[model samples]
Target chain A: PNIINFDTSLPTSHTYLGADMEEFHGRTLHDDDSCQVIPVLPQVMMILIPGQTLPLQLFHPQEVSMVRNLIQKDRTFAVLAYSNVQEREAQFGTTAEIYAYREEQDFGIEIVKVKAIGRQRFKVLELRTQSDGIQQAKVQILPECVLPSTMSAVQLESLNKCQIFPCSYKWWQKYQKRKFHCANLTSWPRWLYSLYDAETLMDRIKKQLREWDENLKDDSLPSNPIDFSYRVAACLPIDDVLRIQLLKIGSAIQRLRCELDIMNKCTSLCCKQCQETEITTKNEIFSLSLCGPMAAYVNPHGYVHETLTVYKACNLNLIGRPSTEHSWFPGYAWTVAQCKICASHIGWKFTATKKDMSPQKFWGLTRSALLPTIP
Target chain B: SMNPPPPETSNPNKPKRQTNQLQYLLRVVLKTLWKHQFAWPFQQPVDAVKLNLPDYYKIIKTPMDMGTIKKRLENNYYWNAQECIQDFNTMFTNCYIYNKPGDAIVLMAEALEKLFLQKINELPTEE
Candidate 1:
């Protein structure tokens, strides 16, 4: 068995005097259509899937004030995905609850460094600008409901073409649909998809995650289907469109199906900014972070870049001298890497500073700079 | 107890010194693997027609071998020691992919892979 022993003692009881695990997790049980107001933070370069860890550096006075105010109340806020081109905020957002925080002053400016984890999904009902210049929204916490194993007409037709008889079985359909809500908008249950099912997806994903980082073990993965889906969503190097699509989805099996389809479609990656120069293929991907192949890491300036790790990448030119300051991976120095053809900022090539580091070199290409090259 | 002073943060000669250590270690590991008796099958890229395994090419898209790895190391194709080690693993994996589990080739790959990992583990971890 792959297990290790721990010598730590149990926690004391004052922290758990009246609160349960759910309260500590910031979970709220709501009526089907419950609406609530929460502070909104606009993240232009991020899509916070539930279960993802978000480290934020708040420098602006208004945002810092919001964090300071939340400390007096429940430390929950909505992260609205924003785009420069679209002059409006995205309707769908995730609730981010602050779990850890510290205050600092950098060059006479007040800053708040917050460590938060994304919680439930919400849909905006109304938006208002606070007196302090921050935004607040009246949002409805989306219901957690798993739809039945109903198939779309197009999917049913494809299954018919493949002579997939198990999908047509009445008893299997009844067994799956009995305990789940019926929705007119779902595909067949994941098991019918074989190699694409949630079970197999978890298997291969776990193998890939563990192969790169020795610290990631079986306990590192969430057993809950809901958390598993979001983990996959947060870790996949996909565009914001697909990432938001995953956020909008309520069912784990459905989200897994979408993820599986995308995984199979994307055979390689190319520079999204350059639009033509190829980067790395799917087989070259490996996880340098315990968060999986893709993870969000914040820079010194508070810019959160979701980066994808690859063993090999090409058509990239290394710029400037390597720096170990603010390095995401310890013992590795990073050099700015840009697309050679278009001279677009792609990401960085990380090299080990010491001789004995396991992975001597690798590439961390930003998800924003990468486009899935479909077959 | 008193805390120790912080260690030196900058070293002008450290880069070249570490590079030499890595180069020396890689050369020793690769030469030892090449000298192994079971290394014959993995010494060069497999000939699809000559080996009478026409489907091998279709199965293994990325072909790797000890000869190619050695040339890569000597020609400075590898960026670091791990790249050279990855090539060795790729060669062993390609063998396992094309051969049966109980076959003599796979057995050789199993033994060689274990030895390679062991040799890698025996390398210096910290200065």
Candidate 2:
């Protein structure tokens, strides 16, 4: 409902604030209740989580036409994944609000470049194609339930039963004993809370996250647990199924519990097409975005890729000349990186065009092409 | 065919090791002095025509500034540390000669002189 505008005359940062949307709080997301039809933009192999950046370059006439119409009403639209088009599973999507836009003409063709941020998740109730070929959908906005600051025993009990849990029965039994014993420390309440509270879970996630990318400082990470949960959800290199589960989960504590297991279970990543091909280890991860090491960036077309930055990658071959056009990292030129065995396009090798860039060269592996290995 | 490569070309003269160290020390200290905020007044030579001060050159015989000192150092004009310090001192003396006793330029010159002396004391001791 609120907007902040920037002047283009002076130097300004284009990075979207990866903060939670305040308007989406305490709203019903049903067709009969508070439903609205939004223009659904198809995204292939990408899921735009809330608080994540959405960069789009819409060149198609129909897409540009949709943006023109959207500016008249609300500058918000739906971004649904079209990866499994053959099975028609474009049900869940995220709403994006346009904050920055510029129009340019290239060889007599009008091009619209937009910088938007994902606001809220939604489930498409009905989908219909317009005459302009853009899909329109009646969507139900999903609700996010923020738990109290202090955790109760009942809340802790329910979290242990989430479907995303990865630990064995024996390990769970031991953890339960430790948790109960630490909770009953009357004299050392602060220490007790530190060992068995959401603060501990958030700190644990931050510790594991920084080990992969140590440049993330305490202030750089979000202090709000709700925003912090979504930030971690958008940043991890896990598979789409696990990522969607993280997106669908309502409670931050439950999500953090799920994330702790995922981060601990994953030690290495391999090619999704060829699971035998080892791409890179978790130690190679680094941050190029303030959000985290992982972020979703759109190509010239409408394909959004949630990519993870890494120092080095193996079993990948570079092809084609490096181009700086639409480069996600400012001064780096990108060359296509394909799988060495299957030749599947996995990511790009970003080489510093300027000699003084800190990282001379690095890789951006798309989450779609990477699968975490079970330890 | 067994003849070795032609003799390598070399310079005729090599400066002493102590002078090399002195040059490095002078460069680093001068950079610090140049970065001081008060050094703005003395960054470049006084533009007499632009300032409409036609008597500037008449009042001061020699003009010196941070930029001139930098160029001179880069061109290897100063032979010893004392020579560079003398030029810096002369620049401050010229400022005093041209400006009033309580003028802003005089105040800046005093601040820079104090900083220059402090840095000079920090120079490494001789072997």
Candidate 3:
């Protein structure tokens, strides 16, 4: 028969400690115990989440011996957060469940792996010294509500967007290829572009969602959903703290409204400046509208043609099309075609358009013929 | 001539020259006598029968003032000549080609001294 059980008495606040010690003198059976404390040395701090694996290099003699003894005895130790160790020596550590162990020897060095799960946080009350001079402590444990996996519809959409875009992968490929170039050209002056990748972007978004859920889970704890939601909301041009406040609000709808409000403000105010800039930089000889579409066909061989065509098709004029003749223009002096729409000078006429032009502007020949034919 | 002169005695007040300095002076005097006479008794085989003993004694007993001056000049000239030669060698070698000035000078001096010792060692020994 399957056993269905519930233990309301189990405390969950206690954390476990990973320690190196000489002996484990068997378990002492007790009744109605609030918490149990184990002795550990060279305290380690870990922000342990469930199912996370931490690989540590064990080089210390005492730690290696302790691990060996634990494996031999089939004993599991807890990885506890170091609280106030001096105050109460017992019950301060969390409980952990040992899952697996493996031993590997490479180049005459022994390495052992022991996987465990952190269960709760506990406070130590008293320590008792054993006959072997090892110490054990009593603890008081507190329970926190267990969080279940609940990804929202919006979060799932965001995750899908992240995976499809995969900006991190793109950035990594770009960065790796850049290594062939001179170091001075590609070396980052600071960490400005470090977070501009897919992994960090997705991680940031996931962390924001988690914080939002944490806030909404408990109302008595002061729901600051807007605070957690600001990372996504502040993707627009809104004030940082305002976006944060919107996130702190417990409702997801309010956070969405805040994001929309910021987006609307951006569209209204930013569009005007963009339009003005476009008009001011416009070539008086030809209409600005013609440059975008006509420039696409002008230089079909060039990347600018491809970029401008796509951008113009999307009606994204603020960033697309040549608004002025500048040194920054792609293939500026190398281009031969003139903007048919804007009546402004352009360079490097596309081969597709070469058939119609004169010999002065377009030498009608295939790219292969244009190059010297060597035997 | 009629009165018997007191037996000649060496002057007690005259200062004696150091052995090394006296040897250098004597060499200088011998060289000067050889130069003046074209040959000195020391340079030629001694013929006791034809030898003018008084003349030989007079030449040998002459005061060594000129010899002392010549020896001093020779010593100074030797050092000066060595210095000039070294300066020219340094010019050609570009200051011993060492990383530091002191090291270059020390190495140059040591090399010069070693070469000099080697050359001196190769010479035929005087019995």
Candidate 4:
């Protein structure tokens, strides 16, 4: 059971008193000390700050009954967050306070607007029964902080940039439409779609585009497309607390840096494997020949001719020699040899160059072996 | 190759009625779905009919007529319903199908119908 642990350490106090819950339809609270409890069914988490009006549509029988009972009793309900529940569980719940409502019924269809002010945060104690057989709850309410805008000039500028851009707003609109269509196709409920907030998506799109631009400009920098994809995967705007978690981090640079770090680690690991393989191959090739000792003792070109004579004595046919201009066989020249008995180019000679030194190795092999030439 | 005459300029006394009758009709269909009473917590099938209406109108509105609208809606209904049913069948054909009880599924279907109907009804019916 995944749960969002609310910051319970914060002090609890009444910042403001809300207007009568419109669904309840009357001022159920006479004094600030005593409060009435209204239950929002489906048990979703809701966070309401003062002065923010939220509109909700009531459809479920349990929810509708809760509203009707409140309206008849003239009382307000406390909006609270869900405790120790996974996102799937919390999807059907939120904290909300009722403000104003209007009922319009045509042909047995009920349409209503629930204008509500989001107030203090509360935790659901237990869902108990009501006189109307609706699910009611006792909750521990927490005070919400009304912080003044602490954005710096740059932050303000960025915020303004976000607000004014058609991209953010347009993307939000399309995102909402897409969510609606997807939910519709999947036979998901409207409440599920209502839980989605497009503002976060707009922010993400802006952040991603900014990061993409940075990546394009810096050749030294590598990016994690997988990490970026994960960011997109985790990008559901259903929970305000989750949204606030994203928002409070506040630096696109920090997010991108974290992603880049992961990418760097993966790259480093891959390079290490390649380096190890290359070193092992080099060691293996070195062990196969005693060319180092041979080169130190005798002139390598002379050694090649001696070896060729041995091969000729053994009746083996050989071919062309290495060229002087060839960079690989330093300080040695080469010649083509023909077999006198068979009239075929058979063996080659390795001749020392003037530039040949004592220790440098130069084994003149045939052109066919050295330069991929045909005999 | 016959082009209709250009629209007349607005007269001072005449109300500038933007002939959004089609728009109104589409709105009605959408509004109906939005406000429709369902037996269960889920939206009705009529909503899917509503949602897909616009696309049908877009395809069928070249030579706009009520008969064409009806025919297109019926054709689209047949096509989309088949698709939806096929998808449902795929999900339920195996033992892996887990039926979750809620109005979410039904409401989604209703919303689709509403959106389709709105689209079809709102199509431009001019000339």
Please state the error at residue A77 of candidate 1 in Å: 0.7
- The residue-level lDDT of candidate 2 at B123 comes to 66
Docking class of 4: incorrect
Query: Comparing only chain A of model 4 with the true chain A, what is the TM-score?
Result: 0.29
Q: Which ten residues in a row have the lowest lDDT in candidate 3 chain A?
A: A8-17
TM-scores of chain B, in order: 0.78, 0.78, 0.22, 0.23
For model 2, residues A146-250, the per-residue Cα lDDT tens digits are 765343432354554542333444654554444544345344544445544565788788888877655545677788877888888878898877776677777
Docking class of 3: incorrect
**Which tens-of-lDDT digit does each residue in A199-295 have in candidate 3?**
3333344433332222222331213333323334322222223422442343443444454444334322111212221211101111111111111
- State the lDDT of candidate 1 residue by residue for B2-114, as single tens digits: 12222232444434223543565557777877766457677667866546776876787667888777665555555457756677787888899888775556765776787
| lDDT for each residue of candidate 4 in A103-191, tens digit (9 for 90 to 100) | 54432323343555444334455666667655566555433222222222223433354433335567666645543443443556533
Taking all chains together, each candidate's TM-score versus the true structure is 0.59, 0.60, 0.23, 0.29
Report the candidate with higher lDDT, 2 versus 4: 2
CA lDDT of A321 in candidate 2?
88
Q: What is the C-alpha lDDT of each candidate?
A: 0.67, 0.69, 0.31, 0.33
- Write candidate 3's Cα lDDT for B44-82 as tens digits: 222323443333223322212223333433434322333
Q: Judged by lDDT, which candidate is best? A: 2
Residue B66 of model 3: what lDDT? 23
Q: Mind sharing the TM-score for model 2?
A: 0.60
DockQ for every prediction shown: 0.01, 0.01, 0.01, 0.01
Chain A TM-score across all models, in listed order: 0.77, 0.78, 0.28, 0.29
Off by over 4 Å in 4: A1-36, A83-97, A129-134, A141-375, B1-102, B105-127
